[PDB]
């Protein structure tokens with residue numbers, strides 16, 4: 001298991017534009033296109049991302065290319081963020097993947113708002129962090145996914161994904 005396989009499990013793979021859990025236009029492996037309620041706007045963002053007139057459908061390779069780019073940006077956002085970097089540096093390899101997962105889903109800004117959980121993770125207070133992470137809209141809205149990430153932080157193992 002690795003970050004790529006982990007997120008591919010959490011986000012799935014779709015080759016046509018679809019609406020995410022928040023009702024936003026997305027494609028591929030959780031690649032958000034826009035928060036605009038306009039499909040045309042989504043098709044436009046899509047074509048610009050791919051570099052061709054897609055008509056709202058991409059290929060597998062195309063989805064994977066967006067995904068590599070998105071994973072890279074996620075990590076880079078963490079490393080550039082003053083509140084996130086130190087947490088990330090303190091964690092082991094499995095738990096780093098859980099932090100990337102959250103950043104991919106909610107953006108660096110969203111993640112940095114879990115101040116209190118972040119501090120517990122940095123202190124390596126696993127059970128406490130898990131409890132704090134669960135008191136969030138994130139957990140209430142996408143409970144199965146949040147449970148999987150939380151267990152990852154708690155245990156430092158890939159068991160939730162096995």
Ligand SMILES: [Cl-]
Nearest residue numbers: 048049050069
């Ligand atoms: Cl892009």
Ligand SMILES: [Cl-]
Nearest residue numbers: 142143144145
């Ligand atoms: Cl879920």
